[PDB]
Structure formats: structure tokens, C-alpha cells
Amino acid sequence: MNTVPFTSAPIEVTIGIDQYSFNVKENQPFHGIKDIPIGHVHVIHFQHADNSSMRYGYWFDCRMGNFYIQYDPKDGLYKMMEERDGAKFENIVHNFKERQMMVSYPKIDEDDTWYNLTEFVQMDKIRKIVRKDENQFSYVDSSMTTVQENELSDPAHSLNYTVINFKSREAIRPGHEMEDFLDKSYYLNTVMLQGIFKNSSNYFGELQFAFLNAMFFGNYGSSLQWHAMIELICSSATVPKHMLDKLDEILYYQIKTLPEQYSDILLNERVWNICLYSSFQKNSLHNTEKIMENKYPELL
């Protein structure tokens, strides 16, 4: 069990850790989060009480370093940092643990939600989408745009998701225009899976990371990416059977976790109706179709 200690909490803030969140008052004696499960990526995220604009946060994996948070009064945000001195960090965490100044990651033992939402998400792939090589953790916020959004402006602060474009030469083989546009299997299996992602685990990892950034930061370009990656599979007549079964599980847990009040902005009506009712895979996402019909029948 790992720990993300905090130097202090000088400004009132709602702090998220994965799917959980808690309110911290201005100058309240808060010194971080303990009992964080090892084996998964995690995200620690922030919304200030005075400016609900800019949700922001950090993806990290405690196996990669000892990380802590300190508020910077100049840049005005809670920053993640790494402490290279292991004895010093262990000592600080022990002192805070003894003084009971840390919240416990509040996982219910039966509960596999976080695993299910991050099954294929790897920190090494996150660090290629979010490029800041000097740190072992990755910052994301509500406003960051994607490479594809930039093509249609600061490159260092961009989300380098894999560009998917259904009306592009990459997607359409010369002489197979109608075939490749109406059945995207070529683009999915040869261009994306064999060529770019290498395997379905990396594709699902990027799909899952895009969803999480959409949900936790309201990041619009991430939502676009999540839906594009779904639509590419659903619009392919030929998909490996294990991928369809896994996609159904992935999407089920994403829909299950989504806040009911955010469905209006985070779910694209066209994609979901096409995917569940018109696409080649309309009959292959049983769990996802059932939860969507019972939780968001209005969208459909």
C-alpha cells in the first residue's frame, strides 16, 4: 500500500483520487492519501473551491517513484513532485501516518471498479500521450487540446492521442473507397492494430485513458477520442471475438461509473445509437446495451 503525501492544503479544494473525492478546507490539517493500491495507475485531481474552472490532476504509478503534492502560491496550483531521498520520504510519511493526518484510499474489498476502468492503461503509454519526459507522472487539465484538435495551439501542452479520421487517406485504400468507408475493418485491423498500436491491449489502454480524462477533467478532445475509438470498432464488420467481448466489459464499467448528471455532455447520441443499433456490432455489446438502456434511455 503506497502513499501520496501533501506538504499542506493552503487553499480550499475538492481532491479526487481515482473515482473518489473529498473536500478539504482552507488551511485544514490535511497531509495526503495513504493505502493506495499497488498494481494500477492512479489519478489525483483537484478543483479549487473559488474557481471550479480548470479541473486538473496527475496520473502516476507509485511503483515508479515516491511522489508528493505541495501547493505553489505563484502558479496557484497543487503540484506533484518526486522526492529522490527514499529515507526522508518514508520518514515524513511515517510521521504523518502516526499523527493520523492522512485520508485512506477508501476501497471496498469486493469492488473492482478501478481495475476495470484501468485494465489496459499503462503509465508508459500515458507518458507518450502526455509528453513531459523529466517527470515520471503526467499532468492533465480540462483545457488541454489534442493533436487532432490542433490540426483543425501550444504543442508541448497537447494530448498526443492517435489520430483517427474516417475520411482520410490513411483510412481509405485507393480503389476500395466504398468498401473501406462502409466497413472499417482494414483501418482497424491493419492500419491501427497491426500497424500503430501493435495489439488490442494498447488500443484499449488509450481508449480507457481518453474516457477517464473526459470524465475526470471534462476534457472535450478526450471525449472525442473515446468515441472515435469505439466507433472504429463498431463500424468494422470483422473484429476478433475476444476484442468484442472485452470492449463490452470496458464500456459497461465506463457507463456504470459515469455521473448520471454528466451524461448530457459526455455521451454522443449519434455514436451510441449507431454503435448499439445500426453498426455491424449492434448485437455484440450485450452488457453495454443493457446498462445504457436502463440508465440513459433518453439519449437513445
Partner: protein
């Protein structure tokens, strides 16, 4: 963006552009079978691709053999249209290629965009105008070459005959759309108007009769009457 009443004069500027109408590409007769079911029989069709500034018409004849053994023909027809338009563009010298292609039906947008990916600078546009190009098969010489075709063929025409020697392309297009609208609303009456006087003939190299300026004003007035009437005869007014 879309082409509408507001940006109509753009059709007659000096940027090359083509209208594409696919409404006569896939044509069928519907009939009963011996068992009393219904079936279709395809007949030859055509793509109507028109430069509205010059009158040049690229009439690509679609022979029924192109549908043999194919499914979902109405969907295929849109893609076949886009394939043939893309092939036409590639066949033209660079300085003759269009800067814009305006499709008369929005369902042609995605097929044509995908076929024209190699031409990123050619704009593919819809229109809000309700243009009467479906009535092109009511022009006798065009219907004749389509129906006689035994194989795929491209035939080039000037749909304005020699009108541009005396009128502008705005006026020529307006005459063309009036004639076609008339032919679409009441083909028999429209054709009676056009041929009633036997001393006015159609030149061998023309599509329409050799009316004087004065006769065109009369003809055009007769076509407007026809269209308004049918609009009464139809809505009772």
C-alpha cells in the same frame, strides 16, 4: 458551405465549378413476376455533370451491366457516381479541373469526398436549391444516347446550344432551369410548347430549337404559365 439563393451569382464567376446530379444513375421499372411478386429491371442511366458557366455537360452513361450481381444498388449508385466524377476530374488537365463540385443531393457528399481525397483543394458542396436536373432525360437527344448505349460511354454536350453568343451565363442557366422545371412538372405540355411551330427546328448539333430572341421570350412566358398552372391544378388555386 451550401449553395443557396443568397450566393447564386457565384455560379457564373471565373472559378471552374461543376454541378453533379445522380438522380438518373440507377433507373428501374417495377413489375410483377409470374408468381405475383414484384421485381425490378434496371435500365440505362446517366450522371449529369454540368459546368453552369460554359454549358459543358459531361454525360456519363451508366449501362445496366454495371449493376450485375451487385447488392444494395441505390447505395452503390452514389459510390459509382463519385467514382466516375473522380475519374473525370483526373482525366482533365490541371487548369481545367474544378475548384468546387456542387452535388444536387446531400447523400452524395460523403461518397464524393472519399473519392476525392487526393484533391484536398477541391471543395465538395451541397446546395439548398431544388434544381430540376432530374428532367434531363426529358431532352430527347440525351434520352436517346442513354437508351441506345450498349456499353459505358461518356458523351459531351453544350446544354446551352449557342445561347452564350447572345446572352450571359446567368441568363442561360435561368432559361435552362425554367425549361427543365417545366419538363419536370408537365413533360407533355412543355414539349408541346417547344415544338408546336414546325418552322423552328433543332439543329443537328443542338439540343433545343433555334428560337429568335423574341421567340425565347414567348417560349419562356409559356413555360412560366405552365408551371404556375400545374401549381394550381396540383394545389387547386
Amino acid at each position: 458551405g451550401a449553395m443557396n439563393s443568397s450566393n447564386y451569382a457565384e455560379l457564373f464567376n471565373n472559378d471552374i465549378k461543376l454541378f453533379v446530379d445522380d438522380t438518373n444513375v440507377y433507373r428501374v421499372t417495377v413489375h410483377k413476376t409470374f408468381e405475383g411478386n414484384v421485381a425490378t429491371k434496371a435500365i440505362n442511366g446517366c450522371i449529369f455533370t454540368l459546368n453552369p458557366k460554359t454549358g459543358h455537360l459531361f454525360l456519363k452513361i451508366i449501362h445496366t451491366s454495371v449493376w450485375a450481381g451487385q447488392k444494395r444498388l441505390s447505395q452503390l449508385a452514389k459510390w459509382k457516381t463519385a467514382e466516375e466524377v473522380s475519374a473525370l476530374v483526373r482525366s482533365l488537365p490541371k487548369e481545367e479541373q474544378p475548384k468546387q463540385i456542387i452535388v444536387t443531393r446531400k447523400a452524395m457528399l460523403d461518397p464524393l469526398e472519399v473519392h476525392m481525397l487526393d484533391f484536398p483543394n477541391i471543395a465538395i458542396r451541397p446546395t439548398e436549391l431544388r434544381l430540376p436536373f432530374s428532367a434531363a432525360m426529358s431532352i430527347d437527344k440525351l434520352s436517346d444516347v442513354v437508351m441506345k448505349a450498349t456499353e459505358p460511354q461518356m458523351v459531351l454536350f453544350n446544354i446551352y446550344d449557342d445561347w452564350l453568343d447572345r446572352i450571359s451565363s446567368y441568363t442561360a442557366f435561368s432559361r435552362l432551369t425554367l425549361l427543365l422545371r417545366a419538363l419536370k412538372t408537365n413533360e407533355e405540355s412543355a414539349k408541346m410548347i417547344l415544338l408546336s411551330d414546325p418552322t423552328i427546328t433543332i439543329k443537328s448539333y443542338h439540343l433545343w430549337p433555334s428560337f429568335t430572341d423574341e421567340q425565347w421570350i414567348t417560349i419562356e412566358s409559356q413555360m412560366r404559365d405552365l408551371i404556375l398552372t400545374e401549381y394550381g391544378r396540383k394545389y387547386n388555386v
